[PDB]
């Protein structure tokens, strides 16, 4: 079962400026009080990222590409974003990959599905029980061939919450290199209305998987009879990575404190060629 | 007759079942050659106080030389120091005067000089800021 | 002092290059090939370091 | 496998050429000369060894080889074999299998 | 004067090696010691992956009638490693255990289960007469005799 929801208002795509976000630990080495110059896939400074939001009247979950990894950010409350799909075709013309954070477990698997146009999960609201009960699970229509599967430990995650300002600032960055799917992540407490803040904070590694398939597109899964609904206020942002060179500053404890982009403007290029954060006259 | 056929394959995709790893005991304070998760090296290991993050394994230096490791089986930090080396010098008056000599091991604390041997514990071991002097009297 | 430190630093830093060989670690070349082929790699390495 | 530095059963277990070889090799088929339809099992080669042998060394020992971890005694036992093995030399074989 | 010779080094003494506290084994008991297997015409197929394989405990066991490997030397299986594992389990006659080799002929090798000319893998067979045999004849196990 899977049906199209079209009750929305229309808006044009919105862009926003990502000042200094999306820096992760490139490797597992430890360093202290050093400035190290690295080359890798990063998110360029002061770039413009695409902005999607679900409010009240809006339900936006389109299919977007996936090249050289992506930086996915979310300012949210009530845990409305849940899933992620990947694959070359997403229609059983080729293999497919799936990650989900259910209300009970976190599931990962590679199989051959056939996703609908608008798959989603749907949670009922305050149906006399005060417990938003998740009952709609419409991701795929079948699962033909499987070569690897896994499921983690069940848990309990609240499906309720209403705040005037989004509290969870979840940052994720995904890559797929030579048959390894890498996921870095970080969580932050924020009090901001409808923007991604100004500040510096690095992203630790979380997972590596040996999948080994071609991935070219992806799509999100959002928490909501066959028409009519209510989505909690939430916003997510998408940006793409490119190969760049950065200068990273490790402090006494080996935690990244600051970074410099060696292709933004000439002053930064000078800093980068001298390998220091201050340049003399 | 009950029969089972194994139909594995080699060396074309990232392995998923490998299995064969075995480990010996851990020693300290003597120049040994070690292999920590494919990190091969040689030196002497000591107990350190560096504070790794949970996900970090190695540790590197200004010139990119490893100088700290984390024990895979018990999560602790070990500091690596290369064991000693240096040149040998012979102090001699001309052979026209005598066939006697003195030996200088430069840059070595001669609590471990021994590792010709007679000039390794011969008549004295005198410590100077330039190294250990053997065969000459203070 | 600055010039002396810098020269020594770059000397030490030249030990992590390839010079055209397969790997910069001698033990990995030795423990992955046969002696009739590891020679052609070790020769490149020693030439560069010299 | 005769050329210097090669690998394989022969070059590794019975006849080893040094890497600084300075000499020549001559080889020609003798099918119609020494091959018999019944099989010239006078020709034996060594199949197993504890380790490879040094250049220009010759091994003639016939002590049985042990494959499995368990030790063996006597003349025969499980996973413990007489290392020698004979060729199936007949003229009927395909190319290469002839002497 | 004073002259220089003969650098020296401390010459390390012993060796050492460490690795993670590996503990996640492969469930071989469920494919080797299962209560009942399938017949040769319906050889059961079980996949193993993402686990730790220990071939020593099975190679040293002598209760197996035959342990014939072709793509790898028996001692090296505990030093190399793999991408996929698949086990094909069945039951045959004691006289047809020689036909399961790749490239051979016979009713089983030509009608039920064939091994490719370049099979990379191993075959492990053992007698279990007293396990699934009865006086009246356990006819549940049967083979293929006629095929196009
Ligand atoms: C990014 O998008 C914004 C949207 O208004 C635009 O003004 C800006 O010029 C864009 N910058 C680049 C580098 O594309
Ligand atoms: C580094 O960590 C230690 C504790 O591990 C802490 O006391 C210290 O304050 C940290 N560094 C700084 C600059 O605060
Ligand atoms: C030199 O004299 C001091 C006393 O002033 C004595 O302690 C020391 O041992 C003497 N050194 C030598 C080499 O005899």
XYZ file of C-alpha atoms and ligand atoms in Angstrom:
758
model
C 0.000 0.000 0.000
C 1.225 3.475 -0.933
C -0.733 6.574 -1.992
C 0.204 10.073 -3.114
C -0.324 13.024 -0.763
C -0.737 16.307 -2.649
C -2.395 18.642 -0.120
C 0.261 21.361 0.071
C 1.051 24.950 -0.758
C 3.714 25.723 -3.356
C 6.954 27.617 -2.767
C 10.158 28.026 -4.787
C 13.402 26.351 -3.690
C 15.215 28.267 -0.959
C 18.971 28.622 -0.533
C 21.007 29.485 2.553
C 24.626 30.355 3.325
C 26.656 27.693 5.161
C 29.355 29.767 6.827
C 31.573 27.232 8.609
C 30.026 23.776 8.896
C 30.766 20.273 7.719
C 34.297 19.544 8.946
C 34.977 15.973 10.045
C 37.995 14.003 11.209
C 39.640 12.748 7.994
C 41.545 9.924 9.727
C 42.043 8.199 13.078
C 45.437 9.666 14.010
C 46.020 11.730 17.149
C 47.865 15.058 17.145
C 48.386 17.860 19.648
C 49.085 21.568 19.111
C 49.660 21.276 15.366
C 48.508 22.697 12.036
C 48.016 19.951 9.449
C 47.164 20.426 5.768
C 44.817 17.820 4.304
C 43.234 17.139 0.919
C 39.834 15.457 0.862
C 36.148 15.850 -0.007
C 34.835 18.789 2.034
C 31.976 21.282 1.911
C 33.331 24.615 0.608
C 33.115 27.556 2.981
C 30.366 30.140 2.526
C 28.564 27.975 -0.013
C 24.830 27.972 -0.714
C 22.924 24.884 0.424
C 19.438 23.835 -0.588
C 16.770 24.193 2.083
C 13.646 22.062 2.509
C 11.182 22.350 5.380
C 7.957 20.734 6.571
C 5.640 23.231 8.280
C 2.184 22.767 9.797
C 0.811 22.672 4.885
C 4.130 21.476 3.437
C 5.314 17.918 2.778
C 8.519 17.989 0.720
C 10.403 14.711 0.145
C 11.745 14.603 -3.419
C 14.467 12.479 -4.994
C 17.873 14.176 -5.137
C 21.225 12.966 -6.512
C 24.147 11.560 -4.516
C 27.614 12.272 -5.914
C 30.830 12.165 -3.889
C 28.878 12.075 -0.638
C 26.568 14.666 0.857
C 26.235 16.843 3.944
C 22.745 16.496 5.424
C 21.741 18.817 8.255
C 18.545 18.947 10.275
C 17.119 21.471 12.700
C 14.300 19.553 14.292
C 12.235 18.518 17.249
C 10.051 15.415 17.703
C 12.267 13.194 15.501
C 10.319 13.462 12.257
C 13.080 12.413 9.828
C 13.687 8.685 10.104
C 15.039 6.979 6.997
C 17.376 7.001 4.020
C 17.361 5.083 0.735
C 20.135 4.621 -1.799
C 20.639 2.895 -5.108
C 21.348 3.252 -8.789
C 17.705 2.925 -9.868
C 15.607 2.268 -6.738
C 13.252 0.209 -8.939
C 14.678 -3.358 -8.818
C 16.504 -2.652 -12.073
C 19.616 -2.818 -9.853
C 20.544 -3.420 -6.221
C 19.356 -1.052 -3.495
C 20.375 -0.046 0.029
C 18.253 0.994 2.996
C 18.862 2.621 6.387
C 16.021 3.239 8.846
C 15.736 4.479 12.429
C 12.474 2.912 13.541
C 10.794 3.725 16.837
C 12.083 0.330 18.042
C 15.245 -0.639 16.124
C 17.746 0.716 13.620
C 17.727 -1.397 10.462
C 20.295 -1.643 7.670
C 20.061 -3.859 4.622
C 20.851 -4.258 0.931
C 18.178 -5.854 -1.253
C 16.303 -5.316 -4.528
C 13.100 -3.356 -3.862
C 10.656 -1.274 -5.916
C 9.979 2.005 -4.121
C 6.800 3.965 -4.754
C 6.825 7.584 -5.875
C 6.275 8.877 -2.319
C 7.133 6.216 0.278
C 6.835 7.364 3.875
C 6.185 6.437 7.472
C 3.077 7.685 9.231
C 2.481 8.241 12.941
C -1.010 8.793 14.293
C -1.513 11.804 16.553
C -3.071 11.877 20.019
C -5.722 9.235 19.298
C -7.120 9.313 22.850
C -3.955 7.607 24.169
C -1.477 10.534 24.372
C 0.928 8.200 22.508
C 1.647 9.075 18.885
C 1.402 5.541 17.487
C 3.391 4.786 14.338
C 1.263 2.635 12.039
C 2.096 3.490 8.403
C 5.150 1.809 6.835
C 5.136 2.302 3.047
C 8.708 2.058 1.771
C 8.772 -0.593 -0.959
C 6.456 -2.958 -2.798
C 8.690 -6.056 -2.745
C 12.164 -7.394 -1.966
C 13.462 -9.776 -4.625
C 17.172 -10.455 -4.027
C 19.250 -9.913 -0.883
C 23.005 -10.255 -0.387
C 23.512 -8.721 3.090
C 21.282 -7.783 6.009
C 21.517 -6.663 9.618
C 19.386 -5.247 12.426
C 20.483 -3.700 15.708
C 19.053 -3.869 19.243
C 15.468 -2.697 19.867
C 15.005 0.465 21.909
C 12.380 3.100 22.719
C 12.370 6.576 21.160
C 9.686 9.148 21.920
C 7.347 10.024 19.044
C 6.086 13.231 20.681
C 7.292 16.790 21.142
C 6.418 20.413 20.371
C 8.797 23.365 20.722
C 8.667 26.939 19.488
C 12.329 26.634 18.477
C 14.029 23.588 17.005
C 16.411 22.046 19.537
C 18.144 19.138 17.791
C 20.882 20.225 15.385
C 21.833 16.918 13.780
C 24.651 16.979 11.235
C 25.480 13.953 9.100
C 27.891 13.426 6.236
C 27.844 10.338 4.028
C 30.409 9.038 1.555
C 30.863 5.922 -0.578
C 34.496 5.220 -1.490
C 35.791 2.096 -3.270
C 33.087 -0.116 -1.798
C 33.008 1.301 1.740
C 30.005 3.299 2.928
C 31.185 5.795 5.549
C 28.926 7.762 7.894
C 30.111 10.598 10.143
C 27.720 12.356 12.488
C 27.376 14.878 15.284
C 24.631 16.216 17.547
C 24.289 19.725 18.965
C 21.865 21.628 21.227
C 20.751 24.859 19.546
C 18.092 27.538 20.046
C 17.433 29.018 16.605
C 14.244 29.541 14.641
C 14.735 28.783 10.944
C 18.465 28.811 10.147
C 21.681 26.847 10.577
C 23.780 28.809 13.102
C 27.247 30.319 13.103
C 29.868 28.287 14.930
C 32.541 25.628 14.725
C 32.230 21.961 15.673
C 33.734 18.887 14.023
C 32.030 15.617 13.097
C 33.334 12.330 14.487
C 33.119 9.059 12.552
C 30.257 6.728 13.364
C 30.049 3.802 10.913
C 31.753 1.985 8.053
C 30.071 -0.760 6.020
C 31.499 -3.015 3.240
C 28.615 -2.827 0.759
C 30.356 -2.557 -2.607
C 27.567 -1.407 -4.956
C 27.105 1.669 -7.136
C 25.101 4.460 -5.479
C 23.836 7.450 -7.470
C 20.588 8.723 -5.899
C 18.970 8.935 -2.485
C 15.790 10.080 -0.770
C 14.594 10.840 2.740
C 11.826 9.291 4.830
C 9.694 11.586 6.959
C 7.256 11.100 9.832
C 3.712 12.210 9.008
C -7.168 8.964 6.072
C -5.384 8.434 2.755
C -5.514 12.222 2.328
C -5.072 14.814 5.048
C -2.300 14.931 7.638
C -0.174 17.028 10.014
C 3.625 17.313 9.883
C 5.536 18.756 12.807
C 7.631 21.828 12.156
C 11.085 20.771 10.977
C 13.744 21.792 8.488
C 16.562 19.993 6.721
C 19.335 21.239 4.473
C 21.374 19.578 1.742
C 24.865 20.367 0.513
C 27.366 18.590 -1.694
C 31.049 17.847 -1.209
C 33.941 18.629 -3.538
C 37.672 17.845 -3.428
C 39.433 20.658 -1.569
C 42.454 21.333 0.627
C 42.054 22.521 4.214
C 44.355 23.592 7.039
C 43.197 22.132 10.360
C 44.290 23.220 13.846
C 44.641 20.557 16.548
C 44.740 21.803 20.140
C 46.301 20.201 23.220
C 43.715 17.417 23.505
C 43.652 16.467 19.830
C 40.218 17.951 19.132
C 39.888 20.126 16.039
C 39.338 23.757 16.997
C 39.586 25.758 13.765
C 40.099 25.414 10.029
C 41.151 27.494 7.030
C 40.060 27.038 3.409
C 42.971 27.447 1.003
C 40.931 28.508 -2.041
C 38.368 31.033 -0.763
C 40.237 34.347 -1.004
C 43.880 35.385 -1.419
C 44.462 36.096 2.274
C 43.504 32.527 3.132
C 45.824 31.298 0.383
C 48.670 33.232 2.002
C 47.839 31.750 5.398
C 47.820 28.302 3.812
C 51.185 28.697 2.094
C 52.842 29.966 5.285
C 51.077 27.360 7.467
C 50.004 29.762 10.191
C 46.907 31.668 11.251
C 48.682 35.047 11.443
C 50.697 36.668 8.652
C 53.214 39.448 9.214
C 53.333 42.670 7.226
C 27.529 -40.828 3.296
C 26.836 -37.246 4.353
C 28.679 -34.754 2.141
C 29.231 -30.988 2.300
C 30.884 -28.802 -0.347
C 32.495 -25.437 0.419
C 32.339 -23.058 -2.561
C 34.245 -19.998 -1.389
C 36.272 -17.709 -3.688
C 39.509 -15.694 -3.489
C 40.753 -12.169 -3.828
C 38.206 -10.236 -5.878
C 35.952 -8.413 -3.362
C 36.262 -6.976 0.168
C 36.388 -10.014 2.443
C 33.592 -10.682 4.932
C 34.803 -13.781 6.838
C 38.524 -13.982 7.491
C 39.235 -15.424 10.949
C 42.940 -16.149 11.403
C 44.393 -13.847 14.070
C 46.337 -14.891 17.171
C 48.129 -12.801 19.785
C 51.009 -13.248 22.228
C 51.738 -11.507 25.531
C 52.859 -7.889 25.983
C 56.323 -6.915 27.256
C 57.859 -3.601 28.282
C 61.189 -1.793 28.691
C 63.321 -3.708 26.159
C 63.957 -3.018 22.488
C 61.539 -5.401 20.748
C 59.995 -5.523 17.284
C 56.206 -5.309 17.306
C 53.146 -5.524 15.060
C 50.073 -3.620 16.298
C 47.184 -4.166 13.869
C 49.547 -4.158 10.911
C 51.659 -1.314 12.332
C 55.119 -2.874 12.211
C 57.977 -1.253 14.076
C 60.798 -1.673 16.549
C 61.529 0.125 19.789
C 60.869 0.179 23.515
C 57.380 0.648 24.949
C 56.518 2.616 28.080
C 53.402 3.692 29.951
C 52.209 7.140 28.875
C 49.625 9.751 29.848
C 48.407 11.025 26.470
C 44.622 11.323 26.221
C 43.290 9.786 23.019
C 39.737 10.236 21.855
C 37.593 7.088 21.876
C 37.845 6.572 18.107
C 41.571 7.294 17.652
C 44.193 4.554 17.447
C 47.647 5.870 16.536
C 49.628 8.991 17.338
C 52.020 10.921 15.145
C 54.687 13.601 15.416
C 55.757 16.803 13.682
C 57.698 14.848 11.051
C 54.924 12.226 10.775
C 56.575 9.464 12.791
C 54.431 7.298 15.042
C 55.230 7.757 18.723
C 52.190 6.382 20.570
C 49.847 3.420 20.161
C 46.762 1.951 21.822
C 46.730 -1.711 22.833
C 43.863 -3.411 20.943
C 42.941 -5.936 23.632
C 43.119 -3.647 26.674
C 42.477 0.029 25.964
C 45.656 1.707 27.203
C 48.285 4.059 25.781
C 51.890 3.058 25.069
C 54.696 5.479 24.222
C 57.322 4.318 21.722
C 61.003 5.235 21.944
C 63.688 3.967 19.536
C 66.519 2.110 21.211
C 69.961 3.625 21.360
C 72.580 4.021 18.653
C 75.716 6.010 17.965
C 79.239 5.941 16.619
C 82.420 4.628 18.212
C 85.586 6.676 18.591
C 89.161 5.615 19.302
C 91.458 8.003 21.176
C 95.094 7.129 20.566
C 98.567 8.589 20.838
C 100.670 7.742 17.827
C 101.797 4.149 17.369
C 105.345 5.493 17.668
C 104.718 5.965 21.403
C 102.434 3.136 22.547
C 99.875 0.564 21.420
C 97.328 1.588 24.066
C 94.004 3.275 23.328
C 90.762 4.531 24.840
C 87.220 4.158 23.512
C 84.357 6.666 23.438
C 80.740 5.602 22.955
C 79.183 8.974 22.184
C 75.600 9.746 23.115
C 75.007 6.591 25.165
C 74.225 6.186 28.862
C 76.545 3.297 29.672
C 74.260 1.346 31.892
C 74.014 -0.793 28.733
C 77.379 -0.509 26.981
C 78.176 -4.169 26.178
C 75.379 -4.600 23.632
C 86.183 -7.143 20.576
C 84.522 -6.966 23.997
C 87.418 -6.474 26.435
C 86.955 -2.699 26.113
C 83.389 -2.940 27.387
C 84.120 -3.287 31.132
C 87.855 -2.574 31.107
C 89.393 -0.761 34.078
C 86.581 1.815 34.256
C 83.341 3.202 32.844
C 83.476 6.989 33.149
C 80.373 9.013 32.252
C 80.761 12.394 30.546
C 78.345 14.729 28.812
C 79.744 13.505 25.478
C 79.175 9.810 26.202
C 80.852 6.942 28.003
C 84.650 6.834 28.097
C 86.433 3.514 28.648
C 90.132 2.966 29.243
C 91.046 6.417 30.585
C 91.404 7.545 34.191
C 89.833 10.650 35.727
C 68.632 28.389 13.870
C 65.539 28.588 11.682
C 67.358 27.518 8.524
C 69.063 24.619 10.269
C 65.818 23.299 11.750
C 64.043 23.612 8.409
C 66.729 21.728 6.485
C 66.750 18.894 9.006
C 62.952 18.763 8.978
C 62.722 18.374 5.215
C 65.442 15.722 5.271
C 63.370 13.642 7.662
C 60.208 14.378 5.686
C 61.635 12.921 2.447
C 61.325 9.394 3.882
C 57.589 9.103 3.122
C 57.675 9.481 -0.674
C 57.346 6.885 -3.420
C 59.835 7.955 -6.119
C 57.844 5.751 -8.508
C 57.906 2.512 -6.514
C 54.862 0.675 -5.165
C 55.053 1.780 -1.529
C 57.235 3.897 0.730
C 57.535 1.178 3.409
C 60.340 -1.261 2.665
C 58.783 -4.038 4.747
C 55.589 -3.931 2.681
C 57.525 -4.311 -0.563
C 59.530 -7.179 0.911
C 56.507 -8.956 2.423
C 54.309 -8.761 -0.693
C 56.526 -9.699 -3.672
C 59.183 -12.208 -4.683
C 62.904 -11.378 -4.606
C 63.099 -11.189 -8.425
C 60.629 -8.263 -8.378
C 61.172 -6.534 -5.028
C 64.667 -5.664 -6.251
C 63.385 -3.398 -9.021
C 61.402 -1.434 -6.413
C 64.034 -1.252 -3.690
C 66.464 0.102 -6.273
C 64.175 3.057 -6.992
C 63.803 3.746 -3.284
C 67.521 3.726 -2.548
C 68.238 5.932 -5.563
C 65.801 8.579 -4.369
C 67.083 8.585 -0.809
C 70.700 8.826 -1.956
C 59.633 -23.207 -14.628
C 63.286 -23.935 -15.458
C 64.240 -20.295 -16.029
C 65.927 -18.625 -13.037
C 63.648 -17.093 -10.435
C 60.521 -18.909 -11.593
C 58.165 -20.644 -9.175
C 56.028 -23.764 -9.089
C 56.260 -27.366 -8.023
C 59.380 -28.361 -9.964
C 61.343 -25.145 -9.529
C 60.477 -25.105 -5.818
C 60.945 -28.693 -4.624
C 63.447 -30.640 -6.744
C 65.520 -28.455 -9.111
C 66.363 -24.822 -8.326
C 68.367 -22.530 -10.599
C 70.292 -19.605 -9.050
C 69.386 -16.018 -9.854
C 72.859 -15.218 -11.253
C 72.703 -18.042 -13.794
C 75.150 -17.843 -16.707
C 74.348 -20.768 -18.969
C 71.991 -22.244 -21.522
C 69.004 -24.578 -21.503
C 68.196 -27.153 -24.190
C 64.861 -28.954 -24.354
C 63.289 -31.210 -26.962
C 60.438 -33.705 -27.020
C 61.215 -37.423 -26.940
C 57.730 -38.889 -27.340
C 58.545 -41.475 -30.007
C 61.750 -42.380 -28.113
C 60.876 -43.082 -24.459
C 57.063 -42.896 -24.241
C 55.108 -46.147 -23.991
C 51.364 -46.718 -24.181
C 51.563 -48.689 -20.936
C 53.210 -45.866 -19.007
C 56.867 -45.236 -18.155
C 56.498 -45.067 -14.383
C 60.284 -45.235 -14.043
C 60.072 -41.426 -13.948
C 59.199 -39.983 -10.540
C 59.058 -36.490 -9.098
C 58.736 -35.120 -5.586
C 55.374 -33.576 -4.709
C 55.828 -32.508 -1.062
C 58.625 -31.087 1.063
C 59.104 -29.550 4.480
C 60.594 -26.511 2.712
C 62.233 -25.462 -0.530
C 65.815 -26.473 -1.267
C 68.947 -24.497 -2.040
C 70.159 -23.790 -5.590
C 71.811 -26.705 -7.384
C 70.918 -29.105 -4.573
C 69.771 -32.698 -5.035
C 67.426 -34.576 -2.691
C 67.104 -38.361 -2.748
C 65.633 -39.116 0.683
C 62.493 -41.269 0.576
C 61.147 -40.763 4.108
C 57.373 -40.411 4.070
C 55.858 -36.932 4.135
C 53.312 -35.838 6.738
C 50.495 -33.532 5.625
C 48.262 -33.322 8.690
C 49.234 -32.052 12.111
C 49.277 -35.532 13.642
C 52.606 -37.398 13.623
C 53.022 -40.628 11.692
C 55.208 -43.723 11.822
C 55.547 -46.992 9.953
C 55.415 -46.863 6.157
C 51.955 -45.404 5.562
C 49.206 -43.528 7.363
C 46.431 -41.011 6.956
C 47.564 -37.591 5.711
C 51.113 -38.993 5.618
C 52.249 -39.945 2.130
C 55.173 -41.325 0.195
C 56.164 -38.008 -1.442
C 57.262 -39.539 -4.754
C 54.790 -39.668 -7.629
C 55.025 -41.057 -11.161
C 54.017 -39.488 -14.462
C 51.394 -40.960 -16.755
C 53.701 -41.006 -19.784
C 51.868 -42.396 -22.812
C 52.001 -41.206 -26.437
C 48.207 -40.875 -26.492
C 48.192 -37.883 -24.132
C 47.736 -34.352 -25.401
C 50.499 -31.875 -26.089
C 52.796 -31.190 -23.155
C 52.036 -34.348 -21.200
C 54.487 -36.177 -23.458
C 58.071 -36.506 -22.189
C 94.437 11.967 17.630
C 90.856 10.716 17.765
C 89.224 8.740 14.952
C 85.733 7.419 14.220
C 84.596 3.892 13.376
C 82.001 1.253 13.923
C 78.516 2.574 14.614
C 76.561 0.282 16.930
C 72.936 -0.513 17.717
C 71.078 -2.173 20.569
C 69.816 -5.049 18.404
C 66.271 -5.843 19.642
C 65.857 -9.235 21.287
C 62.352 -10.748 21.086
C 59.200 -10.413 18.999
C 55.611 -9.511 19.816
C 52.251 -9.340 18.050
C 48.770 -8.208 19.054
C 45.301 -8.142 17.527
C 41.728 -7.395 18.615
C 39.841 -9.624 21.043
C 38.200 -11.439 18.144
C 34.992 -13.219 19.180
C 32.288 -13.837 16.601
C 32.448 -17.373 15.257
C 30.621 -18.951 12.329
C 27.768 -21.394 13.164
C 29.244 -24.546 11.649
C 27.243 -26.754 14.010
C 24.067 -25.833 12.128
C 25.430 -27.073 8.780
C 27.671 -29.990 9.845
C 25.785 -31.460 12.821
C 22.218 -30.751 11.723
C 19.596 -33.329 12.628
C 18.760 -34.133 8.993
C 20.128 -33.012 5.631
C 18.529 -32.967 2.183
C 18.842 -35.559 -0.562
C 21.311 -35.326 -3.435
C 18.605 -34.281 -5.905
C 17.765 -31.349 -3.592
C 21.177 -30.543 -2.132
C 20.570 -27.834 0.452
C 22.444 -24.546 0.082
C 23.418 -22.454 3.114
C 25.334 -19.174 2.936
C 27.935 -18.108 5.507
C 29.393 -14.596 5.632
C 30.352 -11.953 8.212
C 31.844 -14.182 10.900
C 35.087 -15.831 12.055
C 36.057 -19.156 10.465
C 38.328 -21.643 12.273
C 39.325 -24.495 9.957
C 41.847 -26.067 12.353
C 39.281 -27.837 14.535
C 37.727 -29.460 11.450
C 40.914 -30.340 9.559
C 42.471 -32.154 12.523
C 39.278 -34.162 13.085
C 39.684 -37.666 11.656
C 36.042 -38.816 11.769
C 35.622 -37.515 8.199
C 35.889 -40.095 5.432
C 37.332 -37.567 2.980
C 38.595 -33.976 3.191
C 39.680 -33.027 -0.339
C 40.508 -29.407 -1.162
C 41.589 -28.244 -4.614
C 41.963 -24.459 -4.675
C 43.998 -24.125 -1.473
C 46.447 -26.207 0.524
C 44.821 -27.526 3.720
C 47.175 -25.669 6.069
C 46.768 -22.346 4.240
C 43.007 -22.049 4.802
C 43.897 -20.707 8.263
C 46.112 -18.005 6.725
C 44.001 -16.730 3.788
C 40.442 -15.458 3.666
C 37.470 -14.998 1.536
C 34.560 -12.933 0.260
C 31.652 -15.422 0.349
C 31.084 -18.881 1.804
C 28.453 -21.327 0.551
C 27.894 -24.865 1.837
C 26.100 -27.429 -0.334
C 24.966 -30.291 1.911
C 23.532 -33.614 0.751
C 23.762 -37.387 1.212
C 24.910 -39.968 -1.347
C 26.067 -43.566 -1.641
C 29.437 -44.582 -0.250
C 30.537 -45.760 -3.700
C 29.708 -42.458 -5.450
C 31.926 -40.248 -3.276
C 34.595 -40.414 -6.000
C 32.230 -38.977 -8.628
C 31.755 -35.638 -6.833
C 35.188 -34.516 -8.016
C 35.003 -31.845 -10.743
C 34.911 -33.083 -14.321
C 33.988 -36.685 -13.511
C 31.045 -38.667 -14.882
C 28.400 -40.934 -13.374
C 24.739 -40.722 -12.507
C 25.211 -38.327 -9.585
C 27.877 -36.217 -11.296
C 25.746 -35.888 -14.452
C 22.138 -35.851 -13.183
C 22.121 -34.360 -9.664
C 25.132 -32.171 -8.873
C 28.166 -31.270 -10.980
C 31.337 -29.419 -10.022
C 32.935 -27.012 -12.521
C 36.234 -27.721 -14.233
C 37.840 -24.930 -12.167
C 36.100 -25.503 -8.843
C 37.677 -23.512 -6.011
C 36.554 -25.007 -2.728
C 36.614 -28.228 -0.758
C 34.610 -31.409 -0.189
C 34.108 -33.011 3.234
C 32.322 -36.359 3.495
C 31.756 -38.754 6.375
C 29.758 -41.919 6.980
C 26.625 -41.586 9.124
C 25.151 -45.058 8.707
C 24.037 -45.381 12.331
C 22.477 -41.894 12.314
C 19.801 -42.060 9.589
C 19.719 -45.754 8.593
C 17.042 -48.236 9.659
C 16.556 -51.974 9.279
C 13.539 -51.447 7.024
C 15.413 -49.026 4.779
C 15.164 -45.235 5.041
C 13.805 -44.773 1.531
C 13.297 -41.040 2.140
C 16.765 -40.560 0.611
C 16.665 -41.003 -3.159
C 18.508 -39.853 -6.276
C 17.935 -39.101 -9.969
C 18.328 -41.885 -12.532
C 16.725 -40.465 -15.698
C 17.234 -36.995 -17.168
C 17.129 -35.448 -20.626
C 24.012 30.663 -3.997
O 22.584 30.818 -4.053
C 22.145 32.155 -3.759
C 20.636 32.139 -3.783
O 20.103 33.457 -3.799
C 22.739 33.138 -4.763
O 22.356 34.461 -4.403
C 24.256 33.022 -4.783
O 24.793 33.847 -5.812
C 24.666 31.578 -5.028
N 26.113 31.444 -5.002
C 26.778 30.586 -5.782
C 28.269 30.577 -5.628
O 26.202 29.849 -6.576
C 42.188 18.845 27.832
O 41.604 17.778 28.575
C 41.885 17.852 29.980
C 41.319 16.600 30.607
O 41.606 15.452 29.821
C 41.292 19.133 30.557
O 41.638 19.231 31.934
C 41.818 20.346 29.801
O 41.143 21.517 30.242
C 41.605 20.173 28.300
N 42.201 21.279 27.569
C 41.764 22.538 27.668
C 42.492 23.552 26.841
O 40.825 22.843 28.395
C 88.368 15.793 43.220
O 88.332 16.318 44.552
C 87.041 16.226 45.173
C 87.147 16.926 46.507
O 87.176 18.338 46.350
C 86.638 14.762 45.296
O 85.337 14.676 45.867
C 86.645 14.107 43.922
O 86.388 12.714 44.052
C 87.995 14.309 43.240
N 87.968 13.765 41.892
C 88.781 12.788 41.479
C 88.610 12.350 40.054
O 89.617 12.280 42.220
